[PDB]
Enzyme design. Structure first.
Site, mmCIF file in Angstrom:
data_model
loop_
_atom_site.group_PDB
_atom_site.id
_atom_site.type_symbol
_atom_site.label_atom_id
_atom_site.label_comp_id
_atom_site.label_asym_id
_atom_site.label_seq_id
_atom_site.Cartn_x
_atom_site.Cartn_y
_atom_site.Cartn_z
ATOM 1 N N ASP A 1 0.857 -1.178 0.000
ATOM 2 C CA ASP A 1 0.000 0.000 0.000
ATOM 3 C C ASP A 1 0.904 1.243 0.000
ATOM 4 O OD1 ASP A 1 -2.420 1.310 0.048
ATOM 5 O OD2 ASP A 1 -2.507 1.386 2.238
ATOM 6 N N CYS B 1 -7.845 -1.778 -5.764
ATOM 7 C CA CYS B 1 -6.858 -1.989 -4.717
ATOM 8 C C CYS B 1 -7.718 -1.747 -3.476
ATOM 9 C CB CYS B 1 -5.681 -1.001 -4.832
ATOM 10 S SG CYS B 1 -6.020 0.686 -5.419
ATOM 11 N N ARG C 1 -2.596 2.268 -6.345
ATOM 12 C CA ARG C 1 -2.073 1.149 -7.109
ATOM 13 C C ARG C 1 -2.884 0.957 -8.406
ATOM 14 N NH1 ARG C 1 -1.950 -2.553 -1.773
ATOM 15 N NH2 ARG C 1 -3.660 -1.078 -1.344
ATOM 16 N N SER C 2 -4.205 1.096 -8.322
ATOM 17 C CA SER C 2 -5.046 0.960 -9.510
ATOM 18 C C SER C 2 -4.664 2.027 -10.562
ATOM 19 C CB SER C 2 -6.522 1.113 -9.134
ATOM 20 O OG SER C 2 -6.945 0.037 -8.314
ATOM 21 N N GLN D 1 -0.930 7.707 -5.993
ATOM 22 C CA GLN D 1 -0.830 8.318 -4.675
ATOM 23 C C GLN D 1 0.510 8.756 -4.128
ATOM 24 O OE1 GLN D 1 -3.573 8.684 -1.858
ATOM 25 N NE2 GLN D 1 -4.223 9.532 -3.863
HETATM 26 N N1 LIG Z 1 -6.359 9.216 2.595
HETATM 27 C C1 LIG Z 1 -6.199 7.967 3.049
HETATM 28 O O1 LIG Z 1 -5.112 7.473 3.364
HETATM 29 C C2 LIG Z 1 -7.489 7.139 3.143
HETATM 30 C C3 LIG Z 1 -7.968 6.710 1.752
HETATM 31 C C4 LIG Z 1 -6.958 5.933 0.937
HETATM 32 C C5 LIG Z 1 -6.650 4.609 1.278
HETATM 33 C C6 LIG Z 1 -5.721 3.887 0.511
HETATM 34 C C7 LIG Z 1 -5.105 4.496 -0.594
HETATM 35 C C8 LIG Z 1 -4.151 3.733 -1.436
HETATM 36 C C9 LIG Z 1 -2.733 3.779 -1.548
HETATM 37 C C10 LIG Z 1 -2.399 2.860 -2.680
HETATM 38 O O2 LIG Z 1 -1.226 2.754 -3.032
HETATM 39 N N2 LIG Z 1 -3.411 2.222 -3.299
HETATM 40 S S1 LIG Z 1 -4.768 2.654 -2.623
HETATM 41 O O3 LIG Z 1 -5.429 1.543 -2.028
HETATM 42 O O4 LIG Z 1 -5.619 3.346 -3.544
HETATM 43 C C11 LIG Z 1 -5.411 5.820 -0.925
HETATM 44 C C12 LIG Z 1 -6.336 6.537 -0.161
HETATM 45 N N3 LIG Z 1 -8.614 7.840 3.762
HETATM 46 C C13 LIG Z 1 -8.701 7.748 5.095
HETATM 47 O O5 LIG Z 1 -7.911 7.096 5.774
HETATM 48 C C14 LIG Z 1 -9.848 8.488 5.747
HETATM 49 C C15 LIG Z 1 -9.307 9.616 6.637
HETATM 50 C C16 LIG Z 1 -8.502 10.658 5.850
HETATM 51 C C17 LIG Z 1 -9.170 11.642 5.109
HETATM 52 C C18 LIG Z 1 -8.442 12.594 4.388
HETATM 53 C C19 LIG Z 1 -7.043 12.545 4.419
HETATM 54 C C20 LIG Z 1 -6.361 11.569 5.154
HETATM 55 C C21 LIG Z 1 -7.100 10.621 5.873
HETATM 56 N N4 LIG Z 1 -10.551 7.480 6.555
HETATM 57 C C22 LIG Z 1 -11.809 7.186 6.222
HETATM 58 O O6 LIG Z 1 -12.408 7.768 5.318
HETATM 59 C C23 LIG Z 1 -12.491 6.054 7.011
HETATM 60 C C24 LIG Z 1 -13.875 6.646 7.219
HETATM 61 C C25 LIG Z 1 -14.858 6.488 6.234
HETATM 62 C C26 LIG Z 1 -16.127 7.056 6.409
HETATM 63 C C27 LIG Z 1 -16.412 7.782 7.572
HETATM 64 C C28 LIG Z 1 -17.755 8.427 7.745
HETATM 65 C C29 LIG Z 1 -18.033 9.823 7.530
HETATM 66 C C30 LIG Z 1 -19.469 9.919 7.836
HETATM 67 O O7 LIG Z 1 -19.941 11.049 7.734
HETATM 68 N N5 LIG Z 1 -20.163 8.795 8.219
HETATM 69 S S2 LIG Z 1 -19.099 7.584 8.218
HETATM 70 O O8 LIG Z 1 -19.443 6.579 7.255
HETATM 71 O O9 LIG Z 1 -18.929 7.030 9.530
HETATM 72 C C31 LIG Z 1 -15.432 7.932 8.563
HETATM 73 C C32 LIG Z 1 -14.163 7.363 8.388
#
Ligand SMILES: NC(=O)[C@H](Cc1ccc(C2=CC(=O)NS2(=O)=O)cc1)NC(=O)[C@H](Cc1ccccc1)NC(=O)Cc1ccc(C2=CC(=O)NS2(=O)=O)cc1
Ligand SMILES: CCCCCCCCO[C@@H]1O[C@H](CO)[C@@H](O)[C@H](O)[C@H]1O
EC number: 3.1.3.48
Length: 286
Positions: free
Chosen positions: A187, A221, A227-228, A268
């Site tokens: 990741d 992913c 990654r996608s 990313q």
């Molecule tokens: N950004 C990140 O790292 C990841 C997404 C992320 C994850 C992985 C990757 C990948 C890397 C890769 O190489 N491949 S990939 O898989 O694509 C990229 C991005 N996003 C998060 O961790 C965010 C918190 C956050 C927000 C903004 C900025 C930082 C953190 N967490 C959440 O959204 C969990 C969450 C979801 C819905 C609610 C809710 C709100 C509500 O109102 N109700 S609720 O449903 O409870 C509350 C919490």
């Protein structure tokens, strides 16, 4: 494509790499990325259908399920005009959206599914296991008329390939779905080498899963963007080089920004951007 094209391509990579310019290039991409409304994704009733609140499909390019109850799924159609290829990028299915995921695969007539993450990453479930295991090869998704059976499974060092049979229980139509699972792509990281990544991509291509004779390949992913995005950018740029009169005219930044018009956050990290570029120049040789 002649040797001078290869020369310029390789020299360019070396110049960018030796000066660590990926950082600035990636920043410009993030700064210039387009933004569109994601009204449907943000509706209260769709809360439990999104894995991340900051990763949503734009309304204009979201994939709609054919059902009438609630056609929302966190998935986007990436349509690359010049390259002549469409991809569906989606988040890792949640336990309650595995049915929706296969309904999408069925409705879009996809032949292949490309998974680039692992079910558990950093201690939590980043993707529900939506395919069958060896001890229970048959799955029936709740609230769907779809059955899924594991036909074959070939486990390799950096990836696993599976043959699955998807059946519409109402019509009894069955289809072969190929699952290409890259099992060692960290990741926010990159593949172990351009060679392993290219072998994987070429395997996907050779299967016919990316041909216009079938619906768009489904790529995912965990969030369906890092990654996608890397996977799709490399495949698309390779396509452009094979089609254009002058392969050295491919503008990786421009292509990525074009893809980002369809789904937010594709690629990313600066190192993933670097890897995409490296995979393209290395694949161009083949
Ligand atoms: N950004 C990140 O790292 C990841 C997404 C992320 C994850 C992985 C990757 C990948 C890397 C890769 O190489 N491949 S990939 O898989 O694509 C990229 C991005 N996003 C998060 O961790 C965010 C918190 C956050 C927000 C903004 C900025 C930082 C953190 N967490 C959440 O959204 C969990 C969450 C979801 C819905 C609610 C809710 C709100 C509500 O109102 N109700 S609720 O449903 O409870 C509350 C919490
Ligand atoms: C994703 C892969 C994209 C490859 C695009 C390569 C574009 C090459 O670009 C060329 O590189 C040469 C060497 O530095 C320069 O001298 C040329 O002026 C430049 O146009």
């Amino acid at each position: 494509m002649h040797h001078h094209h290869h020369h310029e391509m390789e020299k360019e990579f070396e110049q960018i790499d030796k000066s660590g310019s990926w950082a600035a290039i990636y920043q410009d991409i993030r700064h210039e990325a387009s933004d569109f409304p994601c009204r449907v994704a943000k509706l209260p009733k769709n809360k439990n259908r999104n894995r991340y609140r900051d990763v949503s499909p734009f309304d204009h390019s979201r994939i709609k399920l054919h059902q009438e109850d609630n056609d929302y799924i966190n998935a986007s159609l990436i349509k690359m005009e010049e390259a002549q290829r469409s991809y569906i990028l989606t988040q890792g299915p949640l336990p309650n959206t595995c049915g929706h995921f296969w309904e999408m695969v069925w409705e879009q007539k996809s032949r292949g599914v490309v998974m680039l993450n692992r079910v558990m990453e950093k201690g939590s479930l980043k993707c529900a296991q939506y395919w069958p295991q060896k001890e229970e090869k048959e799955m029936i998704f709740e609230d769907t008329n779809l059955k899924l059976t594991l036909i074959s499974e070939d486990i390799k060092s950096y990836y696993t390939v599976r043959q699955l049979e998807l059946e519409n229980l109402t019509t009894q139509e069955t289809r072969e779905i190929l699952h290409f699972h890259y099992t060692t792509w960290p990741d926010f990281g990159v593949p172990e080498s351009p060679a392993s990544f290219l072998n994987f991509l070429f395997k996907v291509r050779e299967s016919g899963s990316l041909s216009p004779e079938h619906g768009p390949v489904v790529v995912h992913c965990s969030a369906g963007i890092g990654r996608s995005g890397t996977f799709c950018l490399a495949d698309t740029c390779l396509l452009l080089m094979d089609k254009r009169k002058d392969p050295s005219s491919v503008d990786i930044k421009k292509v990525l920004l074009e893809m980002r018009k369809f789904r937010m956050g594709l690629i990313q990290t600066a190192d993933q951007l670097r890897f995409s570029y490296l995979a393209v120049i290395e694949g161009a040789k083949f």
